[PDB]
């Protein structure tokens, strides 16, 4: 069985000769009584193989007396009956025909080769016109079409000296004529002549085709076909039912029609007819052929009596009911079952309820072997009927076996890895699996009708895999982010909040105990309040010594509950930690810190006991919701009366006709929103602390004892808006239009809706519901795409010895920190030695793990930037090291190599999203201020104003780490300078949000030069004031006389000389586009910082983001540094006269100046400086920038997207899929291989790592790096089988076939589909054994 690799190829004719047993004949099947095959047809036993034991069709030859005899009555043979499925017959052809995939798909492969278009070839091969096989007289030409009548002209003209024909035969002759060599050298040559772009591309295309056929050895004449295989029956069967009424394939008629039409054809070739019918028949032939190959491709599709079209061969390989997705990747399985699911509250972590008969059914051969071992059921039939008796020993044995035999657990959707688990069995008297409740989380499951299913660890390898990997102890932190996933959900947390609580009210205040035990004596004797602060001693511990506990006791005035709750503490911990009412977040950090500090099991056991005590006390705690908990505040009516009077006033205004309707819309909607807010304040203050309870004092209040509020405060259920829904008016309503309604709701659920109000609720209700139904497909589609890219990657290595990657800095901008740079680093490994602001204090030797000792040790330090051996900066051929990744989250340690990184990345990423679609500047506080890469000016007011748009202001703290960062317009007006100290709450910045200022940093007289009324401009003289200038019109409105003359008001000295840009020799006057209208007159002065002019006025988003979708409106960038001016004057678009400092000027491109410009016609930029506005292209960024810019860009982008919904995932998940979007770099020079072609950046980095190495200095070729859209990148891959499995398979088949492709079974998909072990993780070891075996031969 065992084999190394696979290889595609064309089927040569002699290959079917080499596969064949017999040409076929008449198509009939059986005798309407004797339901038995006829011969040389479709179910002929003779050639595919025999049906029964050693019998001919009549029964003449049998018994092995006639061992090898073929029956001379029927020509029927003697053998076993398995070879049916390995053999294939064949059929010879009366004509030749061509294969369709080499025709009809994009680039033709055949006329492509020939430089003859398709429809030409059609018109030949629909048999409607002839065409020159060969210009015998070169008077006519090879590849020359000659109509049925023009052919005649040439015919009676010449006769002999041409070959000019029609049909597959002519094409055979031609392809058989043409050489590969001469064309190939001549193509390579005359490329040199004019390698114009489309031309050169086409040259390359055909050249490749040529040398491909050369080197594969595949032949073009074998494109044409004269023998065709045949399929065996049982893939196309014919089978009965009770009525003697059968069932058949979609296919058998295809062969039936085909063979019959051949029969007709040959029959009519015996007879020397006109070729008209010959044509008609053979067109029916090719019809039947290519419809077999693809029914519903070419013509009106073919149906039976069904009127459903008939399934092609191709269809069976294709879509989801294609093989790959239907029965090769997902599969029915033996030894499994399913169930409704209920809880086991009392259970332990490892345990799972198990309806015993399920295991009974499932653990059959175990106990049968066990009874032959015991011999009570000596034989097996005895075992069956004894099983059937229900002997108690059956169950004794079954408990005996089921011990330590672990099991699997499956809910659907198994969206991420934790949607299935593996527990130990425990049996139960019922048909209802129990489970440990807390893990509804990972399943997102609930006891409302959900279901689950099971699978069996038969092999011990699976047994142990299970027990070590999917034992629940293993996996309790998410691998995506570092939180526990066993958060105690709703009731437990609440009973907890009840206990650990501090009334003043109940009783028993200000006494002393030795420890919590006698408080239990009280409380279980029922003597003290439990949520009641009272003095007592404790004795806690701490491992302050080198992992050695530090014992001591002392007092606390603590609640009785908290005192008791200490009792479970495992011996490391303070009492301060247990000094509050323990928000759900609190419990999270509890379990966190326990695991962080001790290890797993104390936290485990702690957790179980916590669940248990929660059950106990929340059963004790007393809990109900009712109608008197539901309280509405009183001061609500007259607020609504105020609203009524005010809307009546605004009604009177709109009646009067002063105020408009949309104004009024915003007015009314805002004031209703304010009313809702006031009601919210009312109800919250009237509920949360509504409770006045007195202890040894007149009056005092504390947190409420109402059920509803404590449900809200625990985070178990409820929320302030939800309580508003039941109690208050809940906001307002958007109709399905997307509008928002003017009259919100008045009453609540407590009072009772209106007819209309609920009728109105309906709209947005159904809206959100259809969204509930219909956002998920996006997620699954997305998900399988993502993983389809990224399976191939697994850790290669431990250290790649590589060099620095990207820098790490926090994301605090807009407000405060949004990822602590602490948190950014977490588990990562440096790029380099790294020091402290106390300088020259290195702590990594270029790389260490960075654990919370380091994280806090350097949170002390005010360092705020570090670099890391990046995911992408890694350089291993075929994968990576482990260092460049760092730490396993869900473990909590550096990965040991050999595990799939892509899969968990996508499960991290796409799992959550299912839910997740659903002027001036003002300092807040005091601190230093930083503005860099800045050219600005002390304006005429005495403050800084920008001349370099790149600048943005920051609020730096007094230390130096930024508090805020905010953009600032070009030439905006400040009240402050850089690197100063200024009070919080101050509007430093100001600008008209419509102006785009034209500040003059030169100071000087102004004169009306270059510019004339109505010519380049208008002259508008303000009716308002009296002071104006020459008033510049827009692109269109100026009269075209001076629209080819860039208008420029001009600055000069007294002498009329242009005031140079001070310090530079560049003159300083402004070429004015529209809206830059100046306020001063001729002869007047501007100063430094003086405006001459003022210039007035989602989920699929992320789909576009990672797809590398490239927008419609680029905010384009400076291709190269140096000065620039504008280009040709708008034949559709204007252009851009580049002028480098020292390079070459000519590069210009179209500009829509209908979309605003940023730079002006005498203004300089640096390369990579933005020029237009809108969105931009990342492709340009990579084309211009390196890696870190764009990398950082999109990671920040989409992390902000999901962090809107408050969703936390680490970066490397993102960093890694990027490198799979860069599997290719396009070449620059040549000499190694061909000139440019997009080739593996990996293999590029090899050949340069060999060829530019001492092989040469360089023969080879520089390159540029290439992006690929994920869905195309996937396809654009070495392996084809993966590429055959998900999308656009057919063309992939062809493209592999043409070239003699040969896969090598490295990928996950590749080695799964073959039924081999993984080349990674578990079978990593075995596979690398195979690796160094092949190394070892």
Partner 1 sequence: RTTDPVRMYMREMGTVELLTREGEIDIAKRIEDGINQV
Residue 874 binding: pick among partner 1, Zn ion, Mg ion, none (C-beta 5-8 Å cut-off by kind): Zn ion
Instruction: Return the residues of window 1053-1082 that contact Mg ion according to CB under 5 A.
Output: none
Beta strand extents in 16-79 (DSSP E only): none
**Closer to Zn ion by Cβ: residue 66 or 1153:** 66
Tokens of 828: 């990562």
Site for Mg ion (CB under 5 A): how many residues? 3
Residue 1198 · residue 1102 · CB < 8 Å: yes
With contacts defined by CB under 8 A, name the span among 279-287, 757-765, 1116-1124, 1228-1236 that binds partner 1.
279-287
Distances (CA, A) of 204 to 189, 195, 210, 1293: 11, 10, 10, 22
**Closer to partner 1 by Cβ: residue 283 or 803:** 283
Residue 1164 · residue 1179 · CB < 8 Å: no
With contacts defined by CB under 5 A, name the span among 445-453, 731-739, 1093-1101, 1155-1163 that binds Mg ion.
445-453
Tokens of 350: 């490892």
Residue 331 binding: pick among Mg ion, Zn ion, partner 1, none (C-beta 5-8 Å cut-off by kind): none
**Closer to Mg ion by Cβ: residue 450 or 483:** 450
Q: Quote the CA–CA distance of 1049 and 1032 in Å, as a whole number.
A: 10
Give the end-to-end CA distance of the chain in Å, rounded to a whole number: 19
Among 16, 57, 1209, 1298, binds Zn ion (CB under 5 A): 57
58 annotated to a ligand binding site: yes
Per CB under 5 A, 441 contacts Mg ion: no
Per CB under 8 A, 271 contacts partner 1: no
Among 7, 245, 300, 332, binds partner 1 (CB under 8 A): 300
Site for Zn ion (CB under 5 A): how many residues? 12
Residue 11 · residue 19 · CB < 8 Å: no
With contacts defined by CB under 5 A, name the span among 439-447, 636-644, 674-682, 1074-1082 that binds Mg ion.
439-447
| Residue whose CB is nearest to Mg ion in the complex, by number | 450
Residue 1246 binding: pick among partner 1, Zn ion, Mg ion, none (C-beta 5-8 Å cut-off by kind): none
Distances (CA, A) of 564 to 509, 536, 665, 1085, 1097: 16, 11, 59, 84, 69
Per CB under 5 A, 342 contacts Mg ion: no
Residue 854 · residue 863 · CB < 8 Å: no
User: 1122: which strand partners?
Assistant: 1165
Residue 448 binding: pick among Zn ion, Mg ion, partner 1, none (C-beta 5-8 Å cut-off by kind): Mg ion
Main-chain dihedrals φ then ψ at residue 868, nearest 5 degrees: -140, 140
Q: What is the x/- site pattern for Mg ion, positions 600-639, by CB under 5 A? A: ----------------------------------------
Among 446, 1023, 1044, 1254, binds Mg ion (CB under 5 A): 446
Instruction: Return the residues of window 872-891 that contact Zn ion according to CB under 5 A.
Output: 874, 880-881, 884
**Closer to partner 1 by Cβ: residue 120 or 1234:** 120
The string over 799-830, giving b where at least 16 C-beta atoms fall within 10 Å of a residue's C-beta and e elsewhere, is ebebeebbebebbbbeeeeebebbebbbbbbb
Q: Quote the CA–CA distance of 388 and 888 in Å, as a whole number.
A: 51
The string over 1048-1087, giving b where at least 16 C-beta atoms fall within 10 Å of a residue's C-beta and e elsewhere, is bbbbbeeeeebbeeeeeeeebbbbbbbbbbbebeeeeebe
**Closer to Mg ion by Cβ: residue 389 or 717:** 717
**Closer to Zn ion by Cβ: residue 562 or 883:** 883
Instruction: Return the residues of window 101-160 that contact partner 1 according to CB under 8 A.
Output: 126, 128
Per CB under 5 A, 223 contacts Zn ion: no
Question: Angle of helix 902-913 relative to helix 776-790, nearest 10 degrees?
Answer: 170
502 annotated to a ligand binding site: no
Contacts of 1020 (CB under 8 A, 6+ apart): 1028, 1031, 1077
Residue 413, preceding peptide bond in cis (omega within 30° of 0): yes
**Closer to partner 1 by Cβ: residue 310 or 996:** 310
Q: Quote the CA–CA distance of 1169 and 1164 in Å, as a whole number.
A: 10
Per CB under 5 A, 354 contacts Zn ion: no
User: Which residue in 857, 847, 855, 912 sits closest to 885, CA to CA?
Assistant: 847
CB of 300 to partner 1, least distance (A): 7
**Closer to partner 1 by Cβ: residue 68 or 274:** 274
With contacts defined by CB under 8 A, name the span among 50-58, 275-283, 349-357, 1047-1055 that binds partner 1.
275-283
Residue 446 binding: pick among partner 1, Mg ion, Zn ion, none (C-beta 5-8 Å cut-off by kind): Mg ion
Q: Quote the CA–CA distance of 890 and 594 in Å, as a whole number.
A: 15
With contacts defined by CB under 5 A, name the span among 491-499, 552-560, 696-704, 800-808 that binds Zn ion.
800-808
Q: Is the dihedral of CA 243, 244, 245, 246 positive or negative?
A: positive
CB of 66 to Zn ion, least distance (A): 10
Per CB under 5 A, 450 contacts Mg ion: yes
**Closer to Mg ion by Cβ: residue 78 or 341:** 341
446 annotated to a ligand binding site: yes
Per CB under 5 A, 444 contacts Mg ion: no
Q: Quote the CA–CA distance of 1010 and 1037 in Å, as a whole number.
A: 18
44 annotated to a ligand binding site: no
Q: Quote the CA–CA distance of 859 and 519 in Å, as a whole number.
A: 43
User: Which residue in 786, 764, 769 sits closest to 913, CA to CA?
Assistant: 786
CB of 99 to partner 1, least distance (A): 19
DSSP 1221: T
594 annotated to a ligand binding site: no
Q: Quote the CA–CA distance of 1134 and 301 in Å, as a whole number.
A: 51
The angle subtended at Cα 791 by Cα 788 and Cα 797, nearest 5°, is 155
Per CB under 5 A, 56 contacts Zn ion: yes
Residue 770 binding: pick among partner 1, Zn ion, Mg ion, none (C-beta 5-8 Å cut-off by kind): none
Among 139, 215, 280, 327, binds partner 1 (CB under 8 A): 280
448 annotated to a ligand binding site: yes
Residue 450 binding: pick among Zn ion, partner 1, Mg ion, none (C-beta 5-8 Å cut-off by kind): Mg ion
Q: Quote the CA–CA distance of 30 and 1149 in Å, as a whole number.
A: 75
Q: Quote the CA–CA distance of 693 and 699 in Å, as a whole number.
A: 7
β-bridge pairing 986-990 and 999-1000:
unpaired
**Closer to partner 1 by Cβ: residue 300 or 307:** 300
CB of 801 to Zn ion, least distance (A): 8
Instruction: Return the residues of window 59-118 that contact Zn ion according to CB under 5 A.
Output: 60, 71, 74, 76
Binding site for Zn ion (CB under 5 A): 56-58, 60, 71, 74, 76, 800, 874, 880-881, 884
**Which residues belong to the annotated binding site for Mg(2+)?**
446, 448, 450
Binding site for partner 1 (CB under 8 A): 126, 128, 276, 280, 283-284, 287, 298-300
**Which residues belong to the annotated binding site for Zn(2+)?**
56, 58, 71, 74, 800, 874, 881, 884
Binding site for Mg ion (CB under 5 A): 446, 448, 450
**Which residues belong to the annotated binding site?**
56, 58, 71, 74, 446, 448, 450, 800, 874, 881, 884
């Amino acid at each position: 069985e065992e084999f190394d690799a696979i290889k595609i190829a064309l089927a040569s004719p002699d290959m079917i000769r080499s596969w064949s047993f017999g040409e076929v004949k008449k198509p009939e099947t059986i005798n309407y009584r004797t339901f038995k095959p006829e011969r040389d047809g479709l179910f002929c036993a003779r050639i595919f193989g025999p049906v029964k034991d050693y019998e001919c069709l009549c029964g003449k030859y049998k018994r092995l007396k006639h061992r090898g005899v073929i029956c001379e009555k029927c020509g029927v043979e003697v053998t076993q009956t398995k070879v049916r499925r390995e053999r294939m017959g064949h059929i010879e052809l009366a004509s030749p025909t061509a294969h369709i995939w080499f025709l009809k798909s994009l680039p033709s492969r055949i006329g492509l080769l020939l430089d003859m278009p398709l429809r030409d070839i059609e018109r030949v091969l629909y048999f409607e016109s002839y065409v020159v096989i060969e210009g015998g007289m070169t008077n006519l030409e090879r590849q020359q079409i000659l109509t049925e009548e023009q052919y005649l002209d040439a015919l009676e003209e010449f006769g002999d000296e041409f070959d000019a024909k029609m049909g597959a035969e002519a094409i055979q002759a031609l392809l058989k004529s043409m050489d590969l060599e001469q064309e190939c050298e001549q193509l390579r040559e005359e490329l040199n002549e004019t390698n114009s772009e489309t031309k050169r591309k086409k040259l390359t295309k055909r050249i490749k085709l040529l040398e491909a056929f050369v080197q594969s050895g595949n032949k073009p004449e074998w494109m044409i076909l004269t023998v065709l295989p045949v399929l065996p029956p049982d893939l196309r069967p014919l089978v009965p039912l009770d009525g003697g009424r059968f069932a058949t394939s979609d296919l058998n008629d295809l062969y039936r029609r085909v063979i019959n039409r051949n029969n007709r054809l040959k029959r009519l070739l015996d007879l020397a007819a006109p070729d008209i019918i010959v044509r008609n028949e053979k067109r029916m032939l090719q019809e039947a052929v290519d419809a077999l190959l693809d029914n519903g491709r070419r013509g009106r599709a073919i149906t039976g009596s069904n009127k459903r079209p008939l399934k092609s061969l191709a269809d069976m390989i294709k879509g989801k009911q294609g093989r790959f997705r239907q029965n090769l990747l997902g599969k029915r399985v033996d030894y499994s079952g399913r169930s409704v699911i209920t809880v086991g509250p009392y259970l332990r972590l490892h345990q799972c309820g198990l309806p015993k008969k399920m295991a009974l059914e499932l653990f059959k051969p175990f106990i049968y072997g066990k009874l032959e071992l015991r011999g009570l059921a000596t034989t097996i039939k005895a075992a069956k009927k004894m099983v059937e008796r229900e002997e108690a020993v059956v169950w004794d044995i079954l408990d005996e076996v089921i011990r330590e035999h672990p099991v699997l657990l499956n809910r659907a959707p198994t969206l991420h890895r934790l949607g299935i688990q593996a527990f130990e069995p425990v049996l139960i008297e019922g048909k209802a699996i129990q489970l440990h409740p807390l893990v509804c989380a990972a399943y997102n499951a609930d006891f409302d009708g959900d279901q689950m299913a099971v699978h069996v660890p038969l092999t011990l390898e699976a047994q142990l895999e299970a027990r070590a990997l999917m034992m629940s102890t293993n996996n309790i932190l998410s691998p995506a982010n570092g939180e526990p996933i066993i958060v105690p959900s709703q009731d437990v947390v609440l009973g907890l909040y009840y206990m650990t609580r501090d009334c003043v009210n109940a009783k028993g205040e200000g006494m002393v105990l030795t420890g919590p035990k006698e408080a239990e004596r009280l409380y279980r004797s029922g003597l003290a309040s439990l949520h009641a602060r009272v003095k007592v001693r404790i004795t806690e511990y701490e491992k302050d010594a080198n992992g050695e506990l530090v014992a001591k006791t002392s007092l606390k005035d603590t609640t009785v509950g908290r005192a008791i709750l200490w009792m479970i503490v495992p011996k490391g911990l303070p009492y301060s930690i247990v000094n509050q009412a323990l928000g759900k977040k609190a419990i999270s950090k509890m379990l966190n810190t326990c695991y962080r500090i001790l290890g797993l099991k104390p936290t485990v056991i702690f957790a179980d006991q916590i669940m248990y005590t929660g059950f106990a006390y929340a059963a004790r705690s007393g809990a109900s919701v009712g109608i008197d908990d539901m309280v509405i505040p009183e001061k609500k009516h007259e607020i609504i009366s105020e609203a009524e009077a005010e809307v009546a006033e605004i009604q009177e205004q709109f009646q009067s006709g002063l105020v408009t309707a949309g104004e009024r819309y915003n007015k009314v909607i805002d004031i209703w929103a304010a009313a809702n807010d006031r009601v919210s304040k009312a109800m919250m203050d009237n509920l949360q602390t509504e409770t006045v309870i007195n202890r040894d004092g007149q009056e005092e209040k504390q947190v409420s004892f109402n059920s509803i509020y404590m449900m809200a405060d625990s985070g178990a259920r409820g929320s302030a808006a939800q309580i508003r829904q039941l109690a208050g008016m809940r906001g307002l309503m958007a109709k399905p239009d997307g509008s928002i309604i003017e009259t919100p709701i008045t009453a609540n659920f407590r009072e009772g809706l209106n007819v209309l109000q609920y009728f109105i609720s309906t709209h947005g209700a159904r809206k959100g519901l259809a969204d509930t139904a219909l956002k998920t497909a996006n997620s699954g589609y997305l998900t399988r795409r993502l993983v389809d890219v990224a399976q191939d990657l697994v850790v290669t290595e431990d250290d790649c010895g590589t060099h620095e990657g990207i820098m790490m800095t926090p994301v605090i901008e807009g407000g405060d920190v949004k990822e602590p740079l602490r948190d950014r680093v977490l588990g990562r490994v440096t790029a380099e030695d790294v020091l402290k602001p106390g300088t020259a204090d290195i702590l990594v030797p270029r790389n260490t793990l960075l654990h919370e000792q380091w994280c806090d040790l350097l949170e002390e330090n005010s360092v705020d930037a570090v670099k890391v051996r990046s995911v992408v900066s890694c350089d291993t051929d075929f994968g990576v090291c482990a260092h460049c990744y760092g730490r396993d989250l869900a473990r909590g340690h550096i990965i040991n190599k050999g595990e799939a990184i892509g899969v968990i990345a996508a499960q991290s990423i796409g799992e959550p999203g299912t839910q997740l679609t659903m002027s001036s500047i003002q300092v807040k506080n005091k601190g230093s201020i930083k503005l860099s890469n800045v050219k600005s000016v002390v304006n005429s007011s005495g403050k800084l104003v920008i001349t370099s748009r790149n600048t943005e202001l920051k609020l730096i703290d007094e230390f130096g780490r930024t508090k805020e960062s905010y953009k600032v317009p070009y030439g905006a007006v400040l009240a402050k300078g850089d690197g100063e100290q200024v009070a919080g709450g101050e509007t430093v910045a100001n600008w008209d949000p419509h102006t785009m200022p034209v500040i003059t940093e030169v100071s000087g007289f102004v004169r009306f030069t270059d510019m004339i009324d109505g010519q380049t401009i208008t002259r508008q003289t303000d009716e308002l004031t009296g002071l104006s200038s020459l008033v510049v019109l827009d692109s269109a409105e100026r009269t075209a006389g001076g629209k080819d003359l860039r208008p420029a008001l001009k600055i000069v000295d007294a002498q009329g000389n242009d005031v140079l840009i001070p310090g530079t020799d560049m003159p300083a006057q402004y070429f004015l586009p529209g809206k830059a209208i100046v306020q001063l007159e001729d002869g007047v002065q501007i100063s430094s910082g003086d405006t001459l002019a003022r210039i007035p006025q989602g989920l699929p988003r992320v789909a576009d983001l990672f797809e590398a979708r490239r927008p419609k409106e680029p905010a384009i960038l400076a291709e190269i540094s140096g000065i620039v001016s504008f280009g040709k004057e708008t034949k559709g678009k204007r252009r851009l006269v580049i002028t480098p400092v020292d390079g070459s000027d000519p590069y210009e491109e179209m500009i829509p100046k209908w979309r605003q410009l940023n730079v002006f016609e005498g203004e300089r930029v640096e390369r990579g400086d933005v020029i237009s506005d809108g969105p931009e292209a990342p492709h340009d960024i990579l084309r211009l920038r390196g890696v870190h810019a764009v990398t950082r860009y999109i990671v920040n982008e989409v992390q902000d997207v999901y962090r809107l919904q408050g969703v936390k995932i680490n970066d490397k998940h993102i960093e890694v899929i990027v490198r799979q979007m860069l599997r290719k770099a396009t070449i620059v020079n040549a000499g190694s291989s061909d000139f440019l072609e997009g080739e593996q950046v990996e293999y590029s980095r090899v050949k340069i790592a060999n060829r530019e190495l001492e092989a040469n200095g360089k023969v080879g070729a520089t390159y540029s790096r290439d992006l690929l859209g994920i869905t195309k990148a996937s396809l654009a891959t070495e392996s084809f089988i993966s590429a055959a499995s998900f999308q656009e398979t057919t063309r992939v088949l062809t493209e592999a076939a043409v070239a003699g492709k040969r896969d090598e079974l490295r990928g996950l998909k590749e080695n799964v589909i073959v039924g081999r072990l993984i080349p990674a993780g578990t079978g990593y070891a075995y596979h690398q054994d195979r690796m160094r075996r092949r190394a070892a031969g």
